[PDB]
Design an enzyme around this catalytic site. Structure first.
Site, mmCIF file in Angstrom:
data_model
loop_
_atom_site.group_PDB
_atom_site.id
_atom_site.type_symbol
_atom_site.label_atom_id
_atom_site.label_comp_id
_atom_site.label_asym_id
_atom_site.label_seq_id
_atom_site.Cartn_x
_atom_site.Cartn_y
_atom_site.Cartn_z
ATOM 1 N N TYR A 1 2.303 42.407 -92.323
ATOM 2 C CA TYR A 1 1.649 43.673 -92.660
ATOM 3 C C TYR A 1 0.690 43.535 -93.831
ATOM 4 O O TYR A 1 -0.443 44.039 -93.773
ATOM 5 C CB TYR A 1 2.717 44.720 -92.906
ATOM 6 C CG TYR A 1 2.248 46.133 -93.111
ATOM 7 C CD1 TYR A 1 1.864 46.928 -92.057
ATOM 8 C CD2 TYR A 1 2.302 46.699 -94.360
ATOM 9 C CE1 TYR A 1 1.510 48.271 -92.259
ATOM 10 C CE2 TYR A 1 1.911 48.003 -94.595
ATOM 11 C CZ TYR A 1 1.554 48.793 -93.532
ATOM 12 O OH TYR A 1 1.194 50.110 -93.768
ATOM 13 N N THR B 1 -12.217 50.624 -101.889
ATOM 14 C CA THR B 1 -10.820 50.949 -101.547
ATOM 15 C C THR B 1 -10.418 52.063 -102.471
ATOM 16 O O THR B 1 -10.404 51.879 -103.687
ATOM 17 C CB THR B 1 -9.903 49.716 -101.701
ATOM 18 O OG1 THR B 1 -10.325 48.685 -100.819
ATOM 19 C CG2 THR B 1 -8.461 50.050 -101.311
HETATM 20 N N1 LIG Z 1 3.720 56.445 -94.154
HETATM 21 C C1 LIG Z 1 3.334 55.814 -95.287
HETATM 22 O O1 LIG Z 1 3.944 55.948 -96.356
HETATM 23 C C2 LIG Z 1 2.135 54.906 -95.253
HETATM 24 C C3 LIG Z 1 1.815 54.234 -96.429
HETATM 25 C C4 LIG Z 1 0.708 53.407 -96.451
HETATM 26 C C5 LIG Z 1 -0.053 53.225 -95.312
HETATM 27 N N2 LIG Z 1 0.281 53.809 -94.132
HETATM 28 C C6 LIG Z 1 -0.587 53.568 -92.941
HETATM 29 O O2 LIG Z 1 -0.918 54.849 -92.343
HETATM 30 C C7 LIG Z 1 -1.050 54.672 -90.949
HETATM 31 C C8 LIG Z 1 -0.089 55.652 -90.260
HETATM 32 O O3 LIG Z 1 1.177 55.036 -89.971
HETATM 33 P P1 LIG Z 1 2.544 55.814 -90.306
HETATM 34 O O4 LIG Z 1 3.707 54.847 -90.331
HETATM 35 O O5 LIG Z 1 2.227 56.733 -91.492
HETATM 36 O O6 LIG Z 1 2.884 56.889 -89.121
HETATM 37 P P2 LIG Z 1 3.012 56.679 -87.545
HETATM 38 O O7 LIG Z 1 3.379 58.082 -87.195
HETATM 39 O O8 LIG Z 1 3.931 55.577 -87.099
HETATM 40 O O9 LIG Z 1 1.527 56.310 -87.034
HETATM 41 C C9 LIG Z 1 1.191 55.109 -86.357
HETATM 42 C C10 LIG Z 1 0.222 55.537 -85.232
HETATM 43 O O10 LIG Z 1 -0.365 54.379 -84.733
HETATM 44 C C11 LIG Z 1 -0.398 54.457 -83.347
HETATM 45 N N3 LIG Z 1 -0.351 53.111 -82.782
HETATM 46 C C12 LIG Z 1 0.632 52.190 -82.928
HETATM 47 N N4 LIG Z 1 0.365 51.082 -82.217
HETATM 48 C C13 LIG Z 1 -0.800 51.295 -81.587
HETATM 49 C C14 LIG Z 1 -1.674 50.563 -80.668
HETATM 50 N N5 LIG Z 1 -1.367 49.352 -80.204
HETATM 51 N N6 LIG Z 1 -2.795 51.184 -80.281
HETATM 52 C C15 LIG Z 1 -3.156 52.410 -80.728
HETATM 53 N N7 LIG Z 1 -2.420 53.166 -81.520
HETATM 54 C C16 LIG Z 1 -1.269 52.629 -81.984
HETATM 55 C C17 LIG Z 1 0.877 55.260 -82.998
HETATM 56 O O11 LIG Z 1 0.840 55.798 -81.696
HETATM 57 P P3 LIG Z 1 1.941 56.734 -80.995
HETATM 58 O O12 LIG Z 1 1.487 58.106 -81.466
HETATM 59 O O13 LIG Z 1 1.691 56.586 -79.546
HETATM 60 O O14 LIG Z 1 3.223 56.183 -81.524
HETATM 61 C C18 LIG Z 1 0.845 56.280 -84.090
HETATM 62 O O15 LIG Z 1 -0.005 57.378 -83.698
HETATM 63 C C19 LIG Z 1 -0.826 53.186 -90.611
HETATM 64 O O16 LIG Z 1 -2.093 52.444 -90.573
HETATM 65 C C20 LIG Z 1 0.044 52.741 -91.787
HETATM 66 O O17 LIG Z 1 0.024 51.305 -91.930
HETATM 67 C C21 LIG Z 1 1.333 54.655 -94.105
#
Ligand SMILES: NC(=O)c1ccc[n+]([C@@H]2O[C@H](COP(=O)([O-])OP(=O)(O)OC[C@H]3O[C@@H](n4cnc5c(N)ncnc54)[C@H](OP(=O)(O)O)[C@@H]3O)[C@@H](O)[C@H]2O)c1
Ligand SMILES: NC(=O)c1ccc[n+]([C@@H]2O[C@H](COP(=O)([O-])OP(=O)(O)OC[C@H]3O[C@@H](n4cnc5c(N)ncnc54)[C@H](OP(=O)(O)O)[C@@H]3O)[C@@H](O)[C@H]2O)c1
Ligand SMILES: NC(=O)c1ccc[n+]([C@@H]2O[C@H](COP(=O)([O-])OP(=O)(O)OC[C@H]3O[C@@H](n4cnc5c(N)ncnc54)[C@H](OP(=O)(O)O)[C@@H]3O)[C@@H](O)[C@H]2O)c1
Ligand SMILES: NC(=O)c1ccc[n+]([C@@H]2O[C@H](COP(=O)([O-])OP(=O)(O)OC[C@H]3O[C@@H](n4cnc5c(N)ncnc54)[C@H](OP(=O)(O)O)[C@@H]3O)[C@@H](O)[C@H]2O)c1
Lengths: 244, 244, 244, 244
Positions: A151, A234
């Site tokens: 990651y 960024t």
């Molecule tokens: N949550 C946090 O604290 C946090 C912190 C830092 C960064 N982020 C970043 O924010 C983003 C959101 O992730 P999350 O964990 O917050 O929530 P999440 O709800 O898991 O969002 C991930 C999304 O990515 C889509 N996805 C996964 N694999 C894919 C593929 N092969 N093709 C197209 N779409 C795909 C998923 O689709 P489905 O809707 O079909 O599952 C979902 O809509 C990510 O880039 C993550 O690395 C999150």
């Protein structure tokens, strides 16, 4: 209204940060295409967007899916003006337990996807002489984290990619930027014990988790005409967890 | 400052930076295994190493090649104490001209290789409670560069990888670091026009290109027992071209 | 790697990091002048340096003291080849409790001192077309720290100073660099409660405090002829507490 | 309107970036107090602000001036909600030609001023449980620049200061951030030869200078309620001249 007449594509818009991004761009005048990995997920996106956009099934690792989605976008709405790369997965493990496919899936999904989608929208942005590409990073891309070397590699790599692309397209009025969240409240974090939460909060000077709408506000700032002189940057949104 | 009794593996050791690294580690007492992608390249490495090491053919994208090389090293010399990831390629193009395989090959060769090789040497380092992993980055990984979005992604990526790995193994006496060269005299730079050189020198305060031996000195410092409290760091060796 | 025939001046050399720097430069062949703020402190430095240098009383906030020390060095040993700015103080307080003189004294002692001393040695370095200036920073300069806004300002400031100076003198064979320690075993850290130590160790992947000699090794690397292509850089020596 | 009911103090608001900042905060509902170093300059600020604020004479190096200005602000408008530290000077010279007073004036004006003014507004922000401090930095604070070691020291130092202050006050709803412009169009730059301009433009991927209103937009974003989870950060607004 900032985004009147603009078409935004937000990958991974089912919930949390990607949904908040989609809704915020709608609220400021954009037509939004939000994606999910299944046909039911895409329909649930269409249900919340209503008349202000559509949900589609997109797998960002599959070039045939990318091409099919963009053709659909182009027929129904027009060319993409704003690309928000939010799609992202984790498959954590300490190095010795990390399988080849756990490495590859993260690199494909979280880094190579940024290349494919940016390439796929760029020509029409160059023709318009105006464009925004924003990718959702992570604090882990800058700090590293044990058990997440895949990651961290992908999230650091997309910054190198974004800086290089920004240098190529800056003079044509396209900016390329990254928003790096810290710890953000989701379904996941709402399910934790008070003790798991307390340890996360201890790392955050603000003393709280961030909200999806806070990431959406940063995205919407960078996507606006008020950020035309910001490129290759960024923007860290993390409550002071990491200060660059 | 001495490496007597240590075994180092230096990938891509035919010439330039990788050769200078190999020769410098020899000069400090290490037994050195240098690699090339052909049997004649490996033999040229054996010729310069003589009694203090050997050359082997390695393809860092092929897990079977990695394992065969490590088993040969283990039979003849022993376990690897110092890994220097120098192997790398470029396939430059502006994003619109960049073919899918030009992206994929750089990511596989320059980033995913660092994961596979690090994973393959780590267990024996953890058992000894002592180890060095040093990867050769690039200034481009931090600054970006037009026409090298693939290369920049890989070189930025390997830093995120290295910080995460560092965090996993720091308490067991293993450090993981990056050396980021600037513009170094090599076959690459000798093949540029006088005008391409002159423009690149204008961006270097030192007013000269760096030498391979200057990169080798920084690597040898980090590989030594005098750098056991330096981990997850990027040492920029670029004549002031980029100051972090 | 040898400093035979070089003259180094190490400010604040009584103990801890500054003493380890002085002893290490001696061990590599330099003649070393170490400083303290009293005549007894200077004599204690003379006692450990013996035949390989001397101790002098210096106040780095007083230009007359700087000039008197340099004239003594020039008469007895010759011109300074290596300047190590280690002298520094802390006056901690949250902003609301921070007195004007607690701000001013830190800025004068920890930042403006680096300007005055660097200016005072630079001409002779420029004439020789060879020189080293190395300043001891702090992780706090890059991360910030509650209750140390004065100290963080000075330690961040000295990096901006060092990059600018590096740019002015790089083409004349002088490098200007910073070494940024993490948590190092010193009188300061020995005087903390077990609880303050334990909490600070929890933020260090290496799981131990650094030693003064570990800082000295990094300084000696940068001061050597093997680091002539490293300028305007910050070398973080912190056991992975902060990864740049 | 974002800033309805808020009182902003913008130091150095006569022209260029500081004026654009003042005008932008007015346009979004704030009452603005803009400062200049003379009584005529302060009157010219009152003339452009009209009913939406006032101009006052402030010397940020003089504690009596700071206290007098804040007492005036408090009597006429109320407590400061938003502090924008824009006051700044340059006094350039290569190190050997840089006088003691050229160093001191820049450190006092550009770095110690940030301490004094932040201290002077902080208590009332803590009482409100809401506050914004934004300081105007410079790309030179991160890159360094030959002939500007004083300026680079101050502009780097104010980032260390801001990170530390942010850590102290994050949990009380006060954010502390920096906006770092690149090359921005002013009266100064409009007077240059086409050849002087061309060399500046060559360093900027965007291929143009930034405008004061572009810096004002970044300030206004950070000062808004849409940036409450951004603290201790540096927002680089430079057309890709420097990508962090
Ligand atoms: N949550 C946090 O604290 C946090 C912190 C830092 C960064 N982020 C970043 O924010 C983003 C959101 O992730 P999350 O964990 O917050 O929530 P999440 O709800 O898991 O969002 C991930 C999304 O990515 C889509 N996805 C996964 N694999 C894919 C593929 N092969 N093709 C197209 N779409 C795909 C998923 O689709 P489905 O809707 O079909 O599952 C979902 O809509 C990510 O880039 C993550 O690395 C999150
Ligand atoms: O230009 P260069 O700089 O001299 O560095 C390239 C080095 O990396 C090596 N390399 C390139 N691709 C590789 C692969 N797939 N596996 C292992 N080493 C590789 C090259 O081997 P060769 O020396 O065989 O080109 C060469 O030694
Ligand atoms: O804690 P520490 O870490 O041991 O370092 C402080 C060092 O800086 C020196 N120092 C403090 N203020 C100074 C000044 N104004 N001029 C020169 N050196 C100074 C101290 O001298 P002393 O050894 O005289 O404290 C001491 O050697
Ligand atoms: N222009 C650029 O390209 C650029 C790039 C990066 C950063 N910056 C930063 O942006 C800010 C604006 O500076 P500028 O050169 O753009 O324009 P400027 O018009 O020279 O603004 C400087 C302002 O600072 C005020 N000032 C100077 N000394 C002062 C003191 N002792 N007390 C209080 N106020 C004082 C001046 O007052 P008077 O009105 O009375 O003269 C003036 O309003 C500075 O912090 C500068 O370092 C500018």
């Amino acid at each position: 209204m900032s985004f009147e007449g603009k078409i935004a594509l937000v990958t991974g818009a089912s919930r949390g940060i990607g949904r908040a991004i989609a809704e915020t761009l709608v609220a400021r005048g954009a037509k939004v295409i939000g994606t999910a990995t299944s046909e039911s997920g895409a329909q649930a996106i269409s249900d919340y967007l209503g008349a202000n956009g559509k949900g589609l099934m997109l797998n960002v690792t599959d070039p045939a899916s990318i091409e099919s989605v963009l053709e659909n976008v182009r027929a129904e709405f027009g060319e993409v003006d704003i690309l928000v790369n939010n799609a992202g997965i984790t498959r954590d493990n300490l190095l010795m337990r990390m399988k080849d496919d756990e490495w590859n899936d993260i690199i494909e999904t979280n880094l190579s996807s940024v290349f494919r989608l940016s390439k796929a929208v760029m020509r029409a942005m160059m023709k318009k002489r105006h464009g925004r590409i924003i990718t959702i990073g992570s604090v882990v891309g800058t700090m590293g984290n044990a058990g997440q070397a895949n990651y961290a590699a992908a999230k650091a790599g997309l910054i190198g990619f974004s800086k290089s692309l920004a240098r190529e397209v800056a003079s044509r009025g396209i900016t390329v930027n990254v928003v790096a969240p810290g710890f953000i409240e989701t379904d996941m974090t709402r399910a934790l014990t008070d003790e798991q939460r307390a340890g996360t909060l201890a790392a955050v000077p603000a003393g709280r988790l961030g909200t999806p709408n806070e990431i959406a506000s940063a995205v919407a700032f960078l996507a606006s005409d008020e950020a035309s002189y910001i490129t290759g940057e960024t923007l860290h949104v993390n409550g002071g967890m990491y200060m660059v």
